[PDB]
Structures are given as structure tokens and as C-alpha cells.
Design a protein around this ligand. Sequence first.
Ligand code: HEM
Ligand code: HEM
Ligand code: NA
Ligand code: NA
Lengths: 717, 717
Amino acid sequence: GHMKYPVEGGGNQDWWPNRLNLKVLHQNPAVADPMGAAFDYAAEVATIDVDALTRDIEEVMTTSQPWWPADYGHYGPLFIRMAWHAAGTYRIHDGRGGAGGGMQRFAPLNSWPDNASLDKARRLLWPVKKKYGKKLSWADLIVFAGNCALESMGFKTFGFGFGRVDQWEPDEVYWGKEATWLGDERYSGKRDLENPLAAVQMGLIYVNPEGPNGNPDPMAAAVDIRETFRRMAMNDVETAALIVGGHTFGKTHGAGPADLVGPEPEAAPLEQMGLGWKSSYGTGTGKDAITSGIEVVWTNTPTKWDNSFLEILYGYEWELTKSPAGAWQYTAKDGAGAGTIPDPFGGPGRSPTMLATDLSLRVDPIYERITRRWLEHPEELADEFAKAWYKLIHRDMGPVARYLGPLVPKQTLLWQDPVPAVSHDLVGEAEIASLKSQIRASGLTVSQLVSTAWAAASSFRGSDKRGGANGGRIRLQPQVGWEVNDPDGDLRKVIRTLEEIQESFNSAAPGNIKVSFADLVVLGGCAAIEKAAKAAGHNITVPFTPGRTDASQEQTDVESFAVLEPKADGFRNYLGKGNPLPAEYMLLDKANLLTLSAPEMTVLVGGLRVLGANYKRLPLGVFTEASESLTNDFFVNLLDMGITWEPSPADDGTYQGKDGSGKVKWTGSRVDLVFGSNSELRALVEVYGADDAQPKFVQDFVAAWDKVMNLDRFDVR
Amino acid sequence: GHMKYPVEGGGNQDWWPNRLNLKVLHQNPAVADPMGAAFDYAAEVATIDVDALTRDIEEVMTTSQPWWPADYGHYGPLFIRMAWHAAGTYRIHDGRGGAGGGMQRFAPLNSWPDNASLDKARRLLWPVKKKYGKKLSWADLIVFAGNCALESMGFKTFGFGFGRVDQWEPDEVYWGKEATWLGDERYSGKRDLENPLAAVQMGLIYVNPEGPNGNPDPMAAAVDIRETFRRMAMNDVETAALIVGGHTFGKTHGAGPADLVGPEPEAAPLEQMGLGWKSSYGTGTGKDAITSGIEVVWTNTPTKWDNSFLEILYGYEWELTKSPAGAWQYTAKDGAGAGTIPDPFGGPGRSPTMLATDLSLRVDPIYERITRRWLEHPEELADEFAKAWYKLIHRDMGPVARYLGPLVPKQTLLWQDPVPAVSHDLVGEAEIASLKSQIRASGLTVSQLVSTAWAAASSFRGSDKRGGANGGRIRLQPQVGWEVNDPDGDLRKVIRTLEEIQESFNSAAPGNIKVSFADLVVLGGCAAIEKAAKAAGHNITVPFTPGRTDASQEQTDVESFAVLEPKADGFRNYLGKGNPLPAEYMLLDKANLLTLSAPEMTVLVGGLRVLGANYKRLPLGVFTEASESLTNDFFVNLLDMGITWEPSPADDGTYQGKDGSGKVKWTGSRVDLVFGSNSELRALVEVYGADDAQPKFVQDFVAAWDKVMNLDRFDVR
Ligand code: HEM
Ligand code: HEM
Ligand code: NA
Ligand code: NA
């Protein structure tokens, strides 16, 4: 090995390969953003002419370009695949992937094997991006083109929301440990796919079109289809509708040997202008195109919505065969259907063909019941595909407040984790002050109030923008039972008291002002922090933004919320079983999901410890002699060289900090000690631990606290 | 190999090992900075009681701490080593390293083998940093503590400048290609050290204390001493003065085997709280301390300034011997000087010892002349050490306007690239506008004016803050003869015409208003940009800040300015011979030294191309039909899929862009085409090439141009 220049990627990871990487807390940094600090994409796309945008995309779709000629004269099918692949990286386990940031245009997604030829697809839409400019993000354009493709070929969609904000660096995501494209080191037990992954091989969207590891067994492939799509939030009906609906259009490409296809875009030479997979087979495009290596045309109407896919699937018997590149596919038996499938460039007709994974829809008993019903009753397919496609393309959009434009449909959807509209006037400054005082007089402790507010708000994750304190779901299943939230039953007492305050305030309230339980949860935390900072000699007011509303249990999909349960929350010194990495790594990952910077994470940990927010009120990291007091004691004591730290003899993830007399003075976890050990984190601790730092600490803590309380408040942004 | 989680360092560099790394353009991002955007270190520094700070440092130096007991009851010598190592990473080829960012507290420098035990040294200063808080950076404190140590032990220093702002992440710098600490793959020929390095092995500051590659030949060691120090801006007299001056104090540490010393700080367990090199030899500290493995005490007065180092060097004869840890060192022959050297902890006196590299001062003919003189003239040694030590610890401070505090002497120093004080009233709005008109009417072309202004300003590098347009040095040696500046070339003509305008304005100007040549060079580029924007149909004003002054040749050290000459400038499409990496990497490297973001680099390239700023007015990348008009044509045409690019058949670093007819329409270099090929840069090009983007492009181009024009203008901020 050799070390490289930083401009060629050399850096400190080379010398200390396992080191904590704080880069995850400064993704998409503002200096790399070419737009002004005042740029507001929502404001820009709110003024776009959707009708003109559609007509322009329709012109692109029927104007073949010589560097990638249009199959059947229509790019729609290619744009549908492009959009499905943009949304198809989404995973429920961390909410990462999806189309919400336009990450398909960056590495590694722009160069995954399964995204072959989408480099040309995205290039075909530059004339639209060029015309609409800052009013249209690549992120929106990529999925809207797929939506327009459907509509122009005869499928009416449920609707569409704009608002995906373009980014300028790829989000770095763990896609698997495999160091070879298409590799597989991600299964254990009886075909247990490693969490958090949602594809069966490195660089695939979901499954292998030739069957598991290339064995074209449709029954076995259905197992992989069902589980990967489950991990992408799709059930059996949704999964079958998406595959049938997608393969109603277009064709696969495998006209010649795959070893004639050159390097992927990130590996390709400069003259290719960001395109990859240059092919020396024939013309390398169009009639000679190679993408997957498979050569299937599912329907006799590749540019039209109808029920041909299932009529063909069930109307023939299927035989294993090979594409011109040598990949497995299926063809109709006994020369049946000869010549009935049209050629993309006017050649002679061909025979019916299907992927092994299409046959899964007929061979798997559950998919068979679903798809045979749609064979007999096609209007049910149209309905389920419209709902599943809408979900797929919007799954990572966050609260519905973020959806913009004239195509947004009004209906509420359970999967959107809906919260009720505001139905009364909101508390003002006087009512907020009164509620603060009442909660402070209620007998709830600073620790209880801060812990509950943090438990509610910190359920948010910035990947797919799910979770948060809006909805008041801390009192509903499953959040009320989460181990980190309610180890001992204390949470139910906090919930009851706040509900009593909600009832007495609302029944006595002036005019038409009413307050939600969800707001009171957050306000309670803000009140306790004002109390604790007063105990520490600081008169501060904690910001509070009203307007959260209270979801019902019936409006809360308990199975869907399961993925939001923390297995680790270093801010509460909580480490459950099953995490992929040691505690300090899980801490930074949590800070990343909360969109926190390193200074924000550092101040939050120090303040939460001394406020008593620790899981089970454990003393780990509680480096203070004061109770219910917002001081910078955590940082001061962390830097005290009078304390000698050793791993606890119990070998239990904890440490003992002894003073000069050999007496144990403090105890701590890996999450606590990492702030005193890591050279970048320790530098932040020395800011907040200095003699002059206590006012800055209180100010920076409150700002970070307020940020977390507001993470999901897109209703006011 | 296995791919890792991003939080453990995984990312796109793993899949494409040689990819351009755009992170070099967002070092120390604002999100990671815990101080406000409003934080103003200069304003905080101005408040510090420097006499109190000196007393507080003196208390630290004389208060031994149990976890690292003080040799001779004084940490002074340790702090001198600390400060000399902080400044000692500096190198002239790229100006990186040095003490100005406090980078010793971060990886990898905090863990270099040569910085062993400085982890404890810095830790000892936390009580001072704790007391002074935001008024005192770690960067200043590390080097001020060394200065204070000299003064406390009897050496009067020349003075001291505060003003080094703390940074919050490591500057990642190429320190060599060796993947093993103390490795050596950096020599070729007889003894040619690869550029840009200024140390003889990976992790060393300058040279090996046991001689080249461990061969304790003092004559060969002097070859390495002279070359590495030269590459750190020190000549023979300065180098001798620094080595004698430092080893006047303290001792080395090698009491036992180095294999009993544990991992360097970045690799050490959490409980060590950021300290490393934990030793199981005896108490592992103090009397049992192991740092280098050498056990030498140079002088009979390790805590006092006097002339004992040279009196001992010349007063004994020296024989080669081994330290207790097995390292080569020298000791007096014939058992001379028994017991004359004191022990750090009251042990028995010991005999005189020296390093191989100390004998170099007596063995090398040039150093022998210099130091034999100081044997009888310690007053000259003191004078030369004061000047060289001041130089060493301020070398990267930039213009003297940055030096803060009450200890900065006013004497001008040639190495500081001085510029005259402003001696007349400065041009105002009326005079600036009149001069712009005169320059626009002078007959100088937009290409000439923009090229010359860029040439002057872009000599700045943010590493050591040398260079820039202040000084008017573009008309002086050596900048007037740099290949990139004056190939043919119009430079002398531009200089002459600007000088005529300066003469004509100054002999007829209002009041006491005089304009400098340096200001006119910059103002000329600003007026040309205004002219080119008008030719495109935009009335704009380019900001301009007067106040540059004109250095004379006698105030310009020609050999010191040699290192500022660009071997590559992608902003002018100039690629000389001898660069370490292909042209697109040298572009990012240049953008980094100009402190530019990726958007700033992008607009500058597109703008300079169409303004005609290319070296030798070559057509590479000049993707426009207009002559000297400020449009976004570069970006529009880069994204034109009607152009097919191929490397030129001449294999000459260039590409041909052909239209549909097969006619060559454009030519470009790697630096041009990388903006169309790299997926992160192409995204920025798509911002500036959209239909709505030309006013944004002009606005951002102007802001980036103004930034480069002002890079060295610390005199006005
Ligand atoms: C088990 C799930 C799936 C598998 C194994 C699969 C596999 C494939 C393969 C191998 C191709 C050929 C790519 C090429 O060579 O050009 C393809 C194309 C395509 N996919 Fe699927 N896919 C799946 C699900 C979906 C879904 C959910 C959609 C959309 C809702 C979709 C829409 C399309 C379309 C429209 C094409 C045609 C592209 C064109 O005409 O250029 N696919 N798919
Ligand atoms: C050829 C150049 C140099 C070489 C080879 C060299 C080598 C060394 C070595 C091996 C040590 C022992 C580290 C340890 O084991 O504790 C040391 C210590 C020291 N160095 Fe030098 N050094 C050089 C230049 C300098 C300079 C230029 C200065 C300051 C102007 C300096 C100041 C010191 C001091 C004060 C110590 C004593 C540290 C203590 O008492 O803890 N050195 N040097
Ligand atoms: Na069809
Ligand atoms: Na001495």
C-alpha cells in the first residue's frame, strides 16, 4: 500500500482505518452549495408551470436522439425504469435511499450495475432541466418524468408532489460490505438478509432477474422478491402491482456479449462526458443495446397501458432459454406466439418472453392468487398500481406538508403517518408562559420532562423524514412501549399528568385557543430546561413553536413505526443489543439521523447528562454534583486530569474514573469517554469546558434542543 | 477487502480509488466550527493581559504534575521542543505545515513518532487554555508557551505575534507515500528528496537523529540537515543557530526498550483520554521516560541559556556509543567530564553526550566555521537564534498586518515579503471611476487586463498566506519572468501602459491622492470585466478596494519567491512539466491554495476562459463565439450533446469536440473536460448552464473574482 495526496483521497483514515469519521456530521456543506444562502427550492417550484413542464417532457419522450435511439420511438418506458430505480434504493431499516435527494446522479448509484443505461436516460432530460432551471430540481425531474411517462402511455396516476431539494454531494450510505460489484456476503442463517440492507447483491435494486444468485427458479426468487420489497415498505399486493405495472411497458436489453460493454460512468474516460458502459457491440446503442444482458419484451404493446402482461403470463407455458448474451430468461413453449411481439426498430416480430422473476408472479401461491384475480378483473390492477406507484415515488418525502403543486391529491394515507389539521386557534405568548408555569408546578421532575420531550422528538430521522414529536405518538403504540422510552413505567405518569394539564387548560381556555398533547410534551421539556438553567444561574427562555396535533392509534401504523425504534441512543446512554458497530459509532449515526453537527451533538450530550435524561437515570456520564441544573460540568470534569480512567473490572461496557485517593468518583460509557478521547471531539469539549464558557454552553444547548424539537415541523417551513 | 460504514470511513473512494476528491475544497467547514459565524478572534486577542498570561504559563512550567513529572522541575525545554515541532512541519514547496493552525493537536501530527510525549506537553497547558477561553487559541498558546519558556530560562526573544485562529478539523496534507511510520520511499539519485517533502522519513520533523537511515555519520547527516532546513526556509546560519539554541535546553529520553511503549494517541484506548505512548517500562514517566530512545543531556545547565552546548561540543572528543534503548549517540572520549552533566531527578551526574546530528555542527565544514565562531562569540549566536526562532514560529503568519498583540516589534524583515506603508490619500469613488475609464480607453484588451490581474492575485496561497497582488511584484523579478505569466508576451507592454496611466494620474490627481501600480493592476482587471459584461449586455460594477502598495526589487527576495511560481494553473489552462498528478488534480490543488470553493472554482474557470485569460491565448476551453464577452457560454457548450469529444490524435493533452458534420468545433484540455465528466462538477455546470442562469453566473463570477483580488488584503480586514 501507499498513501496518496488528499486531492486523490489520501487522509487520516489511511493510518487509522477504523477511526470514527465525523464527516457524517457535515454532509452537503453550504460552501459546496452553488445556490445563495437565501435560496428556497419550495418557493421556486411552487411557481412552475406544471402543464408546460409536462408537454416538454412529452416532447423529450418522443424525440429520439442519435446517441441513444428510442425503442419504439418512445423513451417513456426507459423513464419509468429510471424513476423506479431512483425510488427503489429506499430501505425501511434506516430510511436511507429513495429518490428524495436525486442521488441517482451521483456516485455510487449512478454507476451501480442495475443502473446501467440510466446515464443516458438522465442525459436525455437535460433539455428540460435547462429550460426550467432553479424552478425544477433533478430530484423532482427524475421521478416526474416517470410519472409523465405512465400518463402519456395511457395510465392515469394518483397524483404527484414536487419539493425534493437538489443536493451537491452524494449522501454516503452503507450499501453492503462487498468489495466486488454484484457480490454477495449478506446472508446468514436460513436466508436472513443482513440489516439494514434491502437488496440481495451489491449494486442491485432489489433482486436478481435470473433468480437467486443466477439460479432461475421462480419459486425461490419469489422469496427474495417478497423480502426485499418488504424492506422497501411494499406488501404482497403492492409488490405484484408494481412489477406487473412496470413490465407492462418497454423491454430489456441484451443484444450481444456483455464483455463488450466498457467501464461504468465513474470509471469512464473524460471524453465520454459522464456517460458510461460504452459498448463496442455493433452500434453499441438502440437495436444493439446491452443493459442487463437479458433480451425480453414482456408485452405486445410496450408503449401502451393494457392487460397484455398478465394475459401473456397466463396464456402461454414457459420454457427456460438464453438471451444473445447468455442470460437466463423464459420463452413460450412449442413455438407459441411466434412473431407476435413487436421489435423496437422495425425488425421482425419475436416470441413471448418473461424473466424468471416474472414467472414468480404465477408460480408463487400468494402472488398467483393476486395476479390471477387481476387477469380476470384488470381494473383492480390499475387501482393497486396507482396507489403503489404513488407510495413508491413519495415514500421518503416526509410530512405531507412538504408536497407541493397542483397535482397533490387531498386524500389522507395511513403510510404518510398523518397528523390532524389544526382545528382551533394556537396558544400565544401568554398561554405558553402560563402552561410552562403549570407544568413546572405539576410535580414532574426536570429529568422526567426532558426525557419525555427528547423521547418524542428524537424519533425523527432525516433520511426519510419520518418520526418526530408531531402527532403525539409517544403515548400510542408502539412508542409508548419502546424499551429506551419506558423501561420502568415512568412514562405513563408523565403522559397522564400532561393530559390532565391539557384538559384543564382547554376547558378554561380563552376564546377558541386549544392546546394539543403533542405540543405539551415538547413544551414540558422547554419548561424544565428553563427551570434547570435558572438553578444554574441563568435566566433563559427556551423557544417553542406550537402547532403539533394529536394522531390517534388508528392513524398510526404500528408495524411501520417498528423501524423507528432506537436500538441505540447515545444521547440517553442507551445501548441495546444488535447494533452493527460499537457505541461511539452508533452515537454519530444517531446524530446524523437527527441532522446534528458535531458541535450540536457535543452540547446535547453534555446537557442531557446533567439534566438527568439518561436511560433508567443511570449515573454514567453524569459528571456533576448538582441536580436538575444546566451547567457545563460534563465538559469540565471530562478534562480533569485529576481523574484516572480504567475499564470497569466487571467488563460491562463501563469505565471507572478514580481520584487521587483511589476512590471511584465517576463512571462512564464508551459514549461518554469518546468525547474525552477522540481528538476532534475533545477539541469541542475544551470549548465548552473553559472558564468562560457557561453562557455559550447554555445558549448553544438551547439552540440544539430547539432544533431537535422542530425537526419534523415542515408545517411551519 | 471489505467496504465499511461511512461512519467508519467507507465511501466512494473505495470503489474508485483515484477519483478526484472535492473535499479539499471544503476544509474546516462552518458547520463543524463551534464558534459563531460572528466569532472574531482578533477582537478577543486584543483583550488578553499578556503579562498575566506569561505568569500563568510560568506557573505551569514550574508545577510538576504526577502523570508526567518535570525534568529538572521545569517543563520549559519540553515546551520549546513542542513549539519547534509545531512550526517545524512547514515546507516551502506548497507552504503547508507550520504552527499557524494548531494542527499538532489533531491527526496525523498528534501521532507522528517525532511528536511522542508532546501529547503530555499540550495536556499540561489545558489549565491556561481553560483560564483564557476564547481569548486564546490553542494555536497561539502552543507556540507562545515555547517562547515563554525561552524567556523564563534566560533568553530574551525578538518578540511575538498572536493571531492564529483555531481550526476544528485536521488539514489533510500529503506527508509522503510511505504506509509505514518512519518509512523511506522518498529518495532517488544520490540524495534527491522528492518534492514537496521536507523530512527524510515519514513522521519525522526534519532528519533522523541517528544519521541518515540510522547510519550515525555526522557528515552525511549534515547533508540531510541542510536540505530539509532549506526546504523549511532556513539557511546555514539560521539552521546552526536553531539547533544550538534548542539543545541548549533539556534532554532526550530513552531509559528502556521502545517495545514497552504503547500505541500512538490516535490508536490508544478510550481511557487514556487522548494521550498515547503509554509505557510499561518502570513508572513509564519521568526518570523512566522514553520518547526518542536516545539518552542525551547536551549541557550542564538544561534549564538555563548559556554557551555550554558549543563549549562541550568543542571541548571534548566524541566516540560512538549506544543508548539504553539501543540508539546511536556520542559520548566524550577518555572518560572525560565525568559527573559534569546533572540528572533530571536528583540522580548522579553523568558524562557529556551528543547526537550524531549535533556533531554535524562540528564536522561539516560550513557549520564548523559558523559554530566555531560562536564558541568565542555567544553574543552573535544569541542574535542569530532570536531572529531564526522568530522566523520559525511566524513563518506561516502571512502579511505582518496579521500579527497581533503588544509584543510585535516594528522592524521590517525581508522574509516577510514587506510592502510599503500607504503614504498618500487613497483613490475614492470619483478617482476609481475615472481610472477605470482611462484603462478601458488605454487600448489594453480585456484579455490582457484580466490575464495580468489574475497573474498578480493568484500567486497567493492560503497555506502560508504568501503572495498575492499587494506589492505590485508582477513587474519585478522573479514574477515578471514566470513562464505562466510572460510566455511571449504582452506582460511588459501591459506593465508599461499601466505605469504610464499611474504617472499621468498621479501628476494631475486631486489633493494628496496617489494611486499605486499594484492597485492599477487589479483595477485594470476589474474595469475589463465591467467592459466584457457590457459587451454581453449587462451593466455591472466590479468591487475594488484600494490600498495596495509597490514593493521595490530590493524588498523582494527572489529566491524566496521561487516557490510561489505555478507549475500548473488550470484557471489559465497552463500545465508545466514536473507536476505530481494529472491536470485535473492540479486544478483542485490550485483552487485549494486560492481558498476557493467548488462553485467558486467552477465559475472562475468558465469566466476566465471566455474572457481570454488562457495562457498564450490558446483556444482550449474557449467555448464561445464572442470575443471578450462575459457570458455563461462555457457551461452551455460543455453540456451540448451535439458535440462528440475524442482525444486529439496528436496525443498532446487535448481533445477535439466535433459537431454532427464531423467538423472540429471546439478543443479542450483535461481541465476543461473534467467539468463535463466529473459527476459533482457537472452538477455545478448544470446550474450555470441553464437558461435562467446568466445573471447568477455573472454575479457569482464577480464575487469569486473579487475574492481572489483580495486574498492578501489583511491590511483592510
Ligand atoms: C422483481 C422485481 C424486478 C426485477 C427483477 C426487474 C428487472 C428488470 C430488468 C432486468 C430490466 C431490463 C433492464 C435493461 O436491460 O434495459 C427491467 C426493465 C424495466 N423495468 Fe423492471 N424489474 C423489477 C421491478 C420493476 C418495477 C417495480 C418497475 C416499475 C414500477 C419496473 C419497471 C421497468 C421497466 C418499465 C423496464 C423497461 C425499461 C426499458 O424499456 O428501457 N421494474 N427490469
Ligand atoms: C537537526 C535538527 C534536530 C534534531 C535531529 C533534533 C533531535 C532531537 C531529539 C531526538 C530529541 C529527543 C526527544 C526525546 O527523546 O525527548 C530532541 C529534543 C529537543 N529538541 Fe531537538 N532536534 C533538532 C532540532 C531542534 C531545534 C531546531 C530546536 C529548537 C530551536 C530543538 C529543541 C529541542 C529541545 C528543547 C529538546 C529537549 C526536550 C525535552 O527536554 O523534553 N531541537 N531533539
Ligand atoms: Na403494454
Ligand atoms: Na543550558
